[PDB]
């Protein structure tokens with residue numbers, strides 16, 4: 001309840017009481033009153049934007065986990081997320097967990113073909129309903145997508161939805177970090193973190209790549 | 215088929231839940247694809263509609279303009295030395311003979327880029343200003359997006375039944391060109407070769423010569 | 437983890453009791469008697485139940501998270517998921533033992549052999 | 555109706571039809587919304603604020619991006635890195651960052667201290683701008699005045715309206731120049747004043763079209 | 776366009792007279808029964824079923840005679856006998872018949888067992904197709920649907936009409952092409968995919984003319 005209504009926390013802390021967009025009232029999860037730009041003024045775009053955020057969020061959370069696990073595990077050769085795709089062209093191919101025989105994928109075209117066919121059905125079902133569910137909330141279908149019934153209580157669902165978006169926004173921000181850190185450092189996020197941990201004053205953005213960025 | 219409620223949609227069967235209300239199959243090319251909700255406002259949608267057609271028409275001219283010198287060079291005039299490729303033709307203005315139309319010295323023989331810019335600014339500027347003004351000496355037919363009167367000498371817009379199918383044919387050929395032009399730009403940067411050369415390569419070894427051949431081209435290197 | 441086939445691991449541990457490459461502090465003779473006694477006690481406890489449904493779904497200490505301790509449809513769906521994973525595993529392990537009889541390799545070994553066979 | 559109203563000047567001059575929502579009610583309304591981005595009144599309001607804030611930052615930025623280079627060229631002062639797109643790297647030099655060279659000025663040594671103070675200082679300052687603060691609470695968002703108009707050049711309503719047009723037009727000119735500095739810096743990789751010097755020396759053999767354009771596809775520059 | 780009296784015809788504009796019994800209402804009707812073999816409505820029904828069964832088998836056969844050859848000469852896999860007119864001989868080899876060249880796939884060694892198993896399985900399958908069975912009861916002898924349309928691509932009757940045409944059209948092309956496979960194999964001992972490569976290599980010199988033909992006398 002603290003996350004909804006007019007008494008909800010806001011992105012500008014104390015300096016946000018007099019600075020709140022009219023459309024952002026406290027009805028939807030993750031409402032911190034951060035709509036400085038004119039975006040989402042019209043409810044139609046705001047409703048469309050709210051879904052895209054949760055989608056970009058759930059994707060980022062999957063991406064953030066998956067951009068770290070293979071780099072943190074041996075057998076995968078601690079491959080960097082921005083260097084994982086090339087493995088399909090290696091002689092061995094993509095052997096999950098490094099265990100030979102698992103997938104042994106070697107054709108990039110074949111992988112893309114199955115992905116396109118499967119993802120098109122999946123994304124189509126998510127938009128116009130399908131076998132998993134029909135006539136359900138577009139972003140929060142539940143049912144087959146909530147097997148453990150963790151959100152049965154409306155109150156719990158509300159707080160959990162706040163947890164989902166806040167974790168997602170952190171993942172989206174950190175994924176954007178992965179993109180830039182890789183394009184600048186050239187190393188995986190875990191390697192960048194380890195370097196900082198060792199010698200923070202020496203291993204950081206400013207003391208290593210900031211000068212050559214111009 | 216391409217108009218009204220039961221029209222063609224972008225997601226085919228799984229499109230019912232993806233059709234924005236404001237999209238009701240009135241304008242041409244309404245497959246019901248505005249997931250982002252950019253054209254929610256009636257006014258914003260109208261502006262984007264004009265922008266889409268203008269881009270589509272430039273794209274269509276661009277597609278022919280980015281292949282015609284290369285075609286003739288491979289078989290035909292065979293005179294645009296390194297100017298056949300679209301992303302290496304503009305540099306021909308600084309040539310010893312400069313820009314020679316059809317590779318013919320007698321034609322144009324331009325060798326001053328500043329003059330070209332000034333000439334284009336006044337020419338394109340006036341026409342664009344007239345398009346924005348919504349009114350000019352030539353016949354405008356009272357349609358800023360579709361000024362049939364003077365711009366349609368052949369009178370192919372005579373009957374609305376052909377007009378309705380022609381207008382969707384325009385945007386669909388147009389959208390394809392815009393999508394392909396975006397292709398020309400991307401393919402050019404990644405491959406560096408002319409678009410028609412890229413095709414030859416794909417036909418040579420489709421499994422090897424494809425987009426994933428240049429997958430590791432832009433990899434940040436420690 | 438060990439790189440040894442599941443069939444070959446039986447004899448290897450018998451000759452040298454070990455887990456995850458760590459030698460266990462117990463001669464195989466004590467482990468053999470312990471396994472029989474431990475499993476004997478465990479199975480006698482299981483047989484004490486007299487409710488036919490509870491013999492298949494004891495709950496209580498075996499359902500600490502209370503996921504399917506009710507009569508809801510979630511309980512029915514969860515039980516449907518269990519038997520499907522159960523029947524799959526029964527057929528799958530039948531695959532393990534038949535493949536080890538024919539090919540000679542274990543699970544991961546059969547997978548690698550098939551991939552190389554091409 | 556010289557600047558506001560229906561007889562206001564337009565971005566295409568004679569051949570110009572202003573959008574319905576653009577009715578010459580705000581400064582710099584040359585009726586230019588061909589993309590229809592400010593059709594929504596709420597979005598238009600928020601967009602106007604971004605323009606004024608961007609213009610003021612750009613006006614400060616444009617003046618600040620050339621002042622060290624102008625002084626370095628004329629020999630008025632020696633900076634560790636006078637070029638604007640290199641001033642940030644001064645903090646990593648031997649003696650740190652000294653204002654106008656003089657070691658007795660600022661004499662900053664650590665980027666972390668600069669970063670943390672800026673976050674605290676600008677965090678409070680921007681908080682005061684949106685939620686109001688020490689300078690006053692309840693004042694116009696884009697034009698607070700009061701403490702920010704000590705000289706009172708906006709007391710006359712008519713002059714204030716005309717001067718608001720001047721702020722945007724100098725600001726829009728500054729914003730275009732800033733983008734120019736960035737693009738020129740990325741291409742020429744030389745300070746903005748240096749680019750001007752070269753053009754004045756040989757304007758026909760130093761222009762982008764003659765030096766970089768011909769090498770922007772296939773032949774790197 | 777493909778149904779009714781205004782349907783397209785096999786002879787195009789020159790079609791003119793068409794068989795009276797050969798009206799629309801059926802997929803793939805181009806008004807071609809010049810031999811007058813389906814004048815009897817009972818025989819016409821039977822011939823329609825025979826065409827779609829010969830067509831469906833041809834589509835499977837056309838794809839099945841090209842894929843092992845394509846994979847072999849594309850380096851995708853190594854078969855015992857890629858060419859279709861020799862794949863049967865694989866059972867008479869040292870390693871029997873291995874699917875995709877993998878000794879741990881199928882690994883058949885006895886042609887009898889292959890023949891016996893096919894007779895039993897095909898016999899029951901064909902019996903199920905003509906009298907119903909485990910997959911479903913018989914309603915349309917050539918368009919069962921239900922268990923045979925799990926994806927539901929023909930749920931809408933309008934799409935079902937146009938889709939039937941696509942099958943007979945694609946099927947007929949398969950029958951003609953598979954008939955070519957039979958002849959090309961006899962005239963040219965090379966596989967059909969090899970023939971296509973030769974025609975692409977030198978169409979002027981590699982074709983049914985400038986080769987064979989005169990040998991066929």
Ligand code: CHL
Pocket residue numbers: 657658659660661662663664665667668671
């Ligand atoms: C890391 C090393 C470092 C060093 C050696 C210096 C050195 C200097 N800094 Mg500097 N700075 C350093 C880092 C940094 N500074 C700044 C930001 C600034 C600013 C904003 C300013 C300086 C100023 C100065 C100069 C002030 C001295 C002066 O001229 O006094 C002149 C005489 C006086 C100021 C009066 C007497 C001062 C003296 C301390 C008396 C007070 C004693 C107190 C009793 C003790 C303190 C507690 C009391 C008040 C209860 C000086 C040479 C100042 C400057 O440039 O002035 C010219 C200045 O305004 N620095 C930053 C970013 C946040 C830094 C980051 O690392």
Ligand code: CLA
Pocket residue numbers: 059062063065066067069070073076079084085087094095096097098099102103105437544
């Ligand atoms: C949007 C999210 C996302 C995306 C796009 C990807 C994408 C990718 N992942 Mg990834 N991953 C993600 C999330 C994601 N992941 C998350 C959240 C995790 C944490 C669980 C992982 C953990 C992970 C690992 C460990 C690995 C990948 C790998 C890969 C790459 C190939 C995957 C593959 O082989 O086919 C799809 C994968 C499957 C279909 C899984 C098959 C089922 C497995 C093999 C069975 C379980 C192991 C099995 C029991 C092993 C038997 C022997 C064992 C007991 C010793 C690919 C680019 C592999 C790689 O090499 O990276 C280049 C790799 O090894 N991911």
Ligand SMILES: CC(/C=C/C=C(C)/C=C/[C@@]12O[C@]1(C)C[C@@H](O)CC2(C)C)=C\C=C\C=C(C)\C=C\C=C(C)\C=C\[C@@]12O[C@]1(C)C[C@@H](O)CC2(C)C
Pocket residue numbers: 085112116226404424425426428429430431432433
């Ligand atoms: C989704 C898709 C296609 C969808 C097809 C659809 C919907 C079907 C169309 C139909 O509707 C019609 C018309 C008619 C309907 O009656 C029937 C169907 C059949 C339904 C294509 C994706 C196709 C996607 C492809 C092939 C993308 C290839 C990407 C590559 C090669 C990327 C390479 C690199 O990006 C890396 C990896 C790293 C970078 O640094 C460098 C570069 C080189 C950029």
Ligand SMILES: CC1=C[C@H](O)CC(C)(C)[C@H]1/C=C/C(C)=C/C=C/C(C)=C/C=C/C=C(C)/C=C/C=C(C)/C=C/C1=C(C)C[C@H](O)CC1(C)C
Pocket residue numbers: 034035036037038039056057059060062063064065066067080081082083084085172173175176
């Ligand atoms: C609020 C506001 C208000 C006002 O008004 C205005 C403004 C300010 C504008 C606004 C803001 C906004 C924002 C902030 C945005 C952001 C975004 C993002 C960053 C996203 C991400 C996003 C991101 C994401 C999704 C991500 C994704 C990822 C993924 C899937 C991954 C994948 C993968 C893996 C796993 C691994 C491998 O090896 C590789 C791969 C295969 C690759």
Ligand SMILES: CC1=C[C@H](O)CC(C)(C)[C@H]1/C=C/C(C)=C/C=C/C(C)=C/C=C/C=C(C)/C=C/C=C(C)/C=C/C1=C(C)C[C@H](O)CC1(C)C
Pocket residue numbers: 586587588589590591608609611612614615616617618619637638639640641642729730732733
């Ligand atoms: C009107 C219209 C209409 C239709 O409808 C649509 C459209 C077309 C879209 C529109 C248009 C728009 C536009 C034009 C925009 C532009 C923008 C910009 C460029 C900005 C800048 C912007 C820019 C800016 C701010 C700038 C800033 C800067 C600064 C602060 C500076 C800083 C600094 C200094 C001093 C110096 C040193 O050495 C460095 C530093 C430290 C770094």
Ligand SMILES: CC1=C[C@H](O)CC(C)(C)[C@H]1/C=C/C(C)=C/C=C/C(C)=C/C=C/C=C(C)/C=C/C=C(C)/C=C/C1=C(C)C[C@H](O)CC1(C)C
Pocket residue numbers: 807808809810811812813828829830832833835836837838839840858859860861862863950951953954
């Ligand atoms: C319309 C008309 C009208 C009037 O009546 C006249 C007339 C003329 C009589 C008519 C016409 C008719 C016709 C044209 C007929 C034709 C037919 C055909 C050719 C069929 C095929 C048919 C064909 C077919 C089925 C085929 C099938 C195939 C197959 C099974 C294959 C198998 C196989 C494979 C995969 C592979 C291996 O390694 C070998 C094998 C094992 C061997």
Ligand SMILES: CC1=C[C@H](O)CC(C)(C)[C@H]1/C=C/C(C)=C/C=C/C(C)=C\C=C/C=C(C)/C=C/C=C(C)/C=C/C1=C(C)C[C@H](O)CC1(C)C
Pocket residue numbers: 247248249250251252268269270272273275276277278279280299300301303304392393395396
């Ligand atoms: C629908 C949707 C829905 C949701 O909701 C949202 C969203 C997603 C946002 C949406 C989407 C949209 C889109 C897709 C867009 C696109 C665009 C493009 C790609 C292009 C244009 C546009 C494009 C274009 C115009 C193009 C153009 C081009 C051209 C003219 C050409 C030029 C040229 C020539 C001739 C020749 C030379 O030698 C070279 C050059 C000079 C180079």
